Structure 1
Amino acid sequence: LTDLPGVGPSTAEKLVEAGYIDFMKIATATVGELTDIEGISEKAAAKMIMGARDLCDLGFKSGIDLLKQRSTVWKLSTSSSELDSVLGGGLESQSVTEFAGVFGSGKTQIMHQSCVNLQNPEFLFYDEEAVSKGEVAQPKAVYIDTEGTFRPERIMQMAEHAGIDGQTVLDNTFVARAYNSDMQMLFAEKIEDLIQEGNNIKLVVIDSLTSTFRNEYTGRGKLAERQQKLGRHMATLNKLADLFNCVVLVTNQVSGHAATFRFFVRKGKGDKRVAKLYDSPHLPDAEAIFRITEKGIQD
């Protein structure tokens, strides 16, 4: 931090104590965020922000440099061929993907499968020229469970069928049981703390993203307070995904909010499930057929 213009030993201590340990967080911070650190002037805050931006090279880019930025995105396999294809490779890091669907369509199953797949290095697709092995080493997941449906037995089972160690998944997955939107949102904001503690959080799951908000803001009169709260939640999720190059997955039961990739899942015959991609930034709408068995997601 002292490398930053105007930042000395004392200021650096104030910053690290306020959660600002890396340059990107400072480079992308508002003057308000820093000035509120107390002892950090608005003039110094402005100087270090401008300084961090330059150190991080946050300016105009064009040509081949545009491709380089896009290549920092790695993708996680869903264990389904059709689904990975519809996704253009797999679940994207630096974006939020929503799996919406009717009761029992498999939203939670997909969340569990992703936690398991994170521990199979062959399921993380990336360009080794833009993404180093070190960046995706010892990956960990965070599962914010707002429904109470996290099931360690299912993790063990899916892991077994995938040929990987179930306990290893459990050891590298953090679960937080949230009973309301306040806890849900706070846990999400605390993920940055886990990373500062040395945990390479590469997958974040929110199951469910919308349940608490709906139960708390039923009265369709104060829909403003609700949309404001959820919007701030989503903004935190998107920034977290971008800054820490990780995959953010969220579920939503449906029989409006921001999400970069949107799926609607319904049941097929028995084992069968059909997931319709109806919104993404660069892909055409398409449907993927897969199944959910004791092995987890397959086909």
Structure 2
Amino acid sequence: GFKSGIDLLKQRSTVWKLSTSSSELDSVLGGGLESQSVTEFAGVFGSGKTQIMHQSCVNLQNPEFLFYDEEAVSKGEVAQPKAVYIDTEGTFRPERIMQMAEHAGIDGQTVLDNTFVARAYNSDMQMLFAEKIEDLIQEGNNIKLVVIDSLTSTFRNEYGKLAERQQKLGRHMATLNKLADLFNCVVLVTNQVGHAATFRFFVRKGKGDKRVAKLYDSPHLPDAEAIFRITEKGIQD
């Protein structure tokens, strides 16, 4: 039941990464967004949280954007990847998808066909939608990217009794984190500015196109800052 020595390393090797289309961002991420982990992009208004969630669904459809050790992750495991986008804010825009696709050399329609978008209006729908993700897989959908944009808006606006909230939001995370592990996929969640989450960034604005993404929590990477801009191409630099 316990894994030791070489097994630990082999287990860590089944972890693949998704590129953000930003050199700096990827750099700070240790190579890219990690599968089997939950990565949070908390940030200020118009900081780009949503843009990254979009760019992420797009890059998922460009095979050269999935970095993984072939000796530990067969092409068959990352074949025909599909993303699940749980939209809590109603900020999903299929046109931003088309545009990002365009500038990346991807069939925008392919992205839309391989991305499941669930509109959630309350904390119950949110949690439930994240729970059905398994069924989706069970239906033969190779879910490899999950997006909860955002993660804490519903829970906040619904809850003194702030214990029920944490107790519930924690239950959501449990499902999310487990999801990431058993199905070897990347989990992304946003937060406008208490809960688990292996990676945590805080984004902000700079000079126009400019954005400053600060990585302040991860189990094996140092705190660092990546700089990128948002343009009609999506995330870039």
Task: Give the TM-score category using the shorter length.
Answer: over 0.9
Superposed CA offset, 1:161-220 (max 9, x none): 000100000000000000000000000000001000010000000001000011101xxx
Cα distance in 2 for residues equivalent to 1:85 and 1:208: 24
Cα distance in 2 for residues equivalent to 1:63 and 1:177: 44
How far does residue 158 in structure 1 lie from its aligned partner after superposition? 0.2
Superposed CA offset, 1:114-140 (max 9, x none): 000000000000000000000000000
How far does residue 64 in structure 1 lie from its aligned partner after superposition? 1.6
Question: Could you say what the CA RMSD is over the residues aligned between the two structures, in angstroms?
Answer: 0.5
Q: Secondary structure at the match of 2:151?
A: coil
Cα distance in 2 for residues equivalent to 1:176 and 1:129: 35
Residue aligning to 2:184 = 245
TM-score scaled by structure 1?
Answer: 0.79
Cα distance in 2 for residues equivalent to 1:60 and 1:95: 21
How far does residue 66 in structure 1 lie from its aligned partner after superposition? 1.4
How far does residue 284 in structure 1 lie from its aligned partner after superposition? 0.2
How far does residue 294 in structure 1 lie from its aligned partner after superposition? 0.5
Q: Secondary structure at the match of 2:170?
A: helix
How far does residue 61 in structure 1 lie from its aligned partner after superposition? 1.9
Aligned equivalent of 1:290, options 212, 215, 228: 228
Q: Secondary structure at the match of 1:190?
A: helix
Q: Secondary structure at the match of 1:250?
A: strand
TM-score scaled by structure 2?
Answer: 0.99
Q: Secondary structure at the match of 2:95?
A: helix
Structure 1 segments of 4+ aligned residues over 3 angstroms from their partners = none
Cα distance in 1 for residues equivalent to 2:168 and 2:55: 29
Aligned equivalent of 2:101, options 155, 159, 162: 159
Cα distance in 2 for residues equivalent to 1:243 and 1:120: 23
How far does residue 60 in structure 1 lie from its aligned partner after superposition? 1.7
Cα distance in 2 for residues equivalent to 1:225 and 1:64: 42
How far does residue 91 in structure 1 lie from its aligned partner after superposition? 0.2
Cα distance in 1 for residues equivalent to 2:46 and 2:138: 36
Cα distance in 2 for residues equivalent to 1:258 and 1:295: 32
How far does residue 62 in structure 1 lie from its aligned partner after superposition? 1.7
Q: Secondary structure at the match of 2:208?
A: coil
How far does residue 65 in structure 1 lie from its aligned partner after superposition? 1.6
Cα distance in 2 for residues equivalent to 1:268 and 1:157: 23
Q: Secondary structure at the match of 2:90?
A: coil
Cα distance in 2 for residues equivalent to 1:108 and 1:65: 37
How far does residue 63 in structure 1 lie from its aligned partner after superposition? 1.7
Cα distance in 2 for residues equivalent to 1:178 and 1:119: 24
Higher strand share: 2
Superposed CA offset, 1:21-72 (max 9, x none): xxxxxxxxxxxxxxxxxxxxxxxxxxxxxxxxxxxxxx22222221100000
Residue aligning to 1:107 = 49
Superposed CA offset, 1:134-161 (max 9, x none): 0000000000000001000000000000
Superposed CA offset, 1:48-107 (max 9, x none): xxxxxxxxxxx2222222110000000000000000000000000000000000111000
Count of aligned pairs between the two proteins = 237
Cα distance in 2 for residues equivalent to 1:178 and 1:200: 22
Structure 1 unpaired stretches of 5+? 1-58
Q: Give the number of the structure with larger relative contact order, counting CA–CA contacts within 8 Å between residues 6 or more apart.
A: 2
1:227 lines up with 2:166 in the alignment: yes
Q: Secondary structure at the match of 1:274?
A: strand
